[PDB]
Design an enzyme around this catalytic site. Structure first.
Site, mmCIF file in Angstrom:
data_model
loop_
_atom_site.group_PDB
_atom_site.id
_atom_site.type_symbol
_atom_site.label_atom_id
_atom_site.label_comp_id
_atom_site.label_asym_id
_atom_site.label_seq_id
_atom_site.Cartn_x
_atom_site.Cartn_y
_atom_site.Cartn_z
ATOM 1 N N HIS A 11 -0.894 -52.067 -82.703
ATOM 2 C CA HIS A 11 -1.895 -52.740 -81.892
ATOM 3 C C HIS A 11 -1.928 -54.263 -82.014
ATOM 4 O O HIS A 11 -2.836 -54.909 -81.460
ATOM 5 C CB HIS A 11 -3.281 -52.154 -82.226
ATOM 6 C CG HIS A 11 -3.421 -50.691 -81.895
ATOM 7 N ND1 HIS A 11 -3.421 -50.217 -80.597
ATOM 8 C CD2 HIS A 11 -3.577 -49.611 -82.694
ATOM 9 C CE1 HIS A 11 -3.560 -48.898 -80.615
ATOM 10 N NE2 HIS A 11 -3.656 -48.507 -81.875
ATOM 11 N N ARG A 19 3.461 -59.694 -70.354
ATOM 12 C CA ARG A 19 2.213 -58.946 -70.242
ATOM 13 C C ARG A 19 2.385 -57.885 -69.172
ATOM 14 O O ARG A 19 1.418 -57.386 -68.612
ATOM 15 C CB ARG A 19 1.036 -59.865 -69.889
ATOM 16 C CG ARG A 19 0.830 -61.086 -70.796
ATOM 17 C CD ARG A 19 0.159 -60.768 -72.164
ATOM 18 N NE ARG A 19 -1.226 -60.291 -72.067
ATOM 19 C CZ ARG A 19 -2.306 -61.074 -72.007
ATOM 20 N NH1 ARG A 19 -2.181 -62.394 -71.996
ATOM 21 N NH2 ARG A 19 -3.517 -60.539 -71.932
ATOM 22 N N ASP A 20 3.637 -57.552 -68.891
ATOM 23 C CA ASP A 20 3.980 -56.743 -67.725
ATOM 24 C C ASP A 20 4.629 -55.429 -68.144
ATOM 25 O O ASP A 20 4.750 -55.155 -69.328
ATOM 26 C CB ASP A 20 4.923 -57.535 -66.801
ATOM 27 C CG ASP A 20 6.190 -58.004 -67.520
ATOM 28 O OD1 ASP A 20 6.435 -57.598 -68.676
ATOM 29 O OD2 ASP A 20 6.960 -58.785 -66.919
ATOM 30 N N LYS A 38 3.773 -42.086 -76.203
ATOM 31 C CA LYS A 38 2.340 -42.222 -76.390
ATOM 32 C C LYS A 38 1.686 -42.571 -75.049
ATOM 33 O O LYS A 38 2.159 -43.444 -74.329
ATOM 34 C CB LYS A 38 2.023 -43.288 -77.438
ATOM 35 C CG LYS A 38 0.555 -43.424 -77.717
ATOM 36 C CD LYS A 38 0.281 -44.331 -78.894
ATOM 37 C CE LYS A 38 -1.199 -44.347 -79.220
ATOM 38 N NZ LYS A 38 -1.489 -45.365 -80.254
ATOM 39 N N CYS A 78 -0.882 -50.640 -72.375
ATOM 40 C CA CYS A 78 0.260 -49.923 -71.832
ATOM 41 C C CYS A 78 -0.125 -48.497 -71.530
ATOM 42 O O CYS A 78 -0.639 -47.793 -72.413
ATOM 43 C CB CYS A 78 1.422 -49.978 -72.812
ATOM 44 S SG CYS A 78 1.839 -51.699 -73.235
ATOM 45 N N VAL A 100 -13.163 -56.119 -77.846
ATOM 46 C CA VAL A 100 -12.516 -54.863 -78.183
ATOM 47 C C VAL A 100 -13.330 -54.117 -79.218
ATOM 48 O O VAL A 100 -14.106 -54.715 -79.959
ATOM 49 C CB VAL A 100 -11.103 -55.066 -78.743
ATOM 50 C CG1 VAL A 100 -10.206 -55.693 -77.684
ATOM 51 C CG2 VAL A 100 -11.154 -55.937 -80.017
ATOM 52 N N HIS A 111 -8.060 -48.530 -86.622
ATOM 53 C CA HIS A 111 -8.117 -47.746 -85.399
ATOM 54 C C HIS A 111 -8.547 -48.567 -84.189
ATOM 55 O O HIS A 111 -9.499 -49.336 -84.272
ATOM 56 C CB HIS A 111 -9.085 -46.576 -85.606
ATOM 57 C CG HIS A 111 -9.462 -45.865 -84.349
ATOM 58 N ND1 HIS A 111 -8.608 -45.011 -83.690
ATOM 59 C CD2 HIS A 111 -10.618 -45.857 -83.639
ATOM 60 C CE1 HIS A 111 -9.208 -44.524 -82.620
ATOM 61 N NE2 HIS A 111 -10.433 -45.019 -82.570
#
Ligand SMILES: [Zn+2]
Length: 116
Positions: A11, A19-20, A38, A78, A100, A111
Site C-alpha cells: 500500500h 497513476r494509470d 488481487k 487499482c 484514508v 491494514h
C-alpha cells in the site's frame, strides 16, 4: 513488525511513476499481488512518516477499531478488470486525493480499508 512491512509492500509507493492502468498492472505484479490477481488494492503516495502518523498524531478514531487520516493523501486505486483472475492481471486505475482509513497495531499501519 512484519504486518507493517506487508502494509508498505501492498500500500505504499512514495513517488509513483504513473497513476494509470499501466502503473497499476506493473505495480500489482512487482509487489506480488497477481498470484492470483488481487481484486482491489490502493497505493498511498507521499511521505512514509505521515502515513505512520495516522496511528497517532495525523489520525482520529473511526469505528470499529479503524482510524481515519486528519489530512488527505494522493492515492492510486487499482481495480481488477477482464475476466477470471489468473495472470496476466489487467487493472484499471483510479487516482484520488482524499482522507484514508487504516487499521493500526502498536502505532503501525497494518491494514488499508478499501471501502471508498
Ligand atoms: Zn476481477
Amino acid at each position: 513488525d512484519p504486518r507493517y512491512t506487508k502494509f508498505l509492500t501492498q500500500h505504499y509507493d512514495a513517488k509513483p511513476k504513473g497513476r494509470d492502468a499501466r502503473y497499476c498492472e506493473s505495480m500489482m505484479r512487482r509487489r506480488g499481488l497477481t498470484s492470483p490477481c488481487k481484486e482491489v488494492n490502493t497505493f498511498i503516495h507521499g511521505n512514509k512518516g505521515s502515513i505512520k502518523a495516522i496511528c497517532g498524531a495525523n489520525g482520529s478514531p473511526y469505528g470499529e477499531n479503524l482510524r481515519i487520516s486528519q489530512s488527505p493523501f494522493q492515492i492510486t486505486t487499482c481495480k481488477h478488470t477482464g475476466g477470471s483472475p489468473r495472470p496476466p492481471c489487467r487493472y484499471r486505475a483510479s487516482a484520488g486525493f482524499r482522507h484514508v482509513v487504516i487499521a493500526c497495531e502498536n502505532g503501525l499501519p497494518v491494514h488499508f480499508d478499501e471501502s471508498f
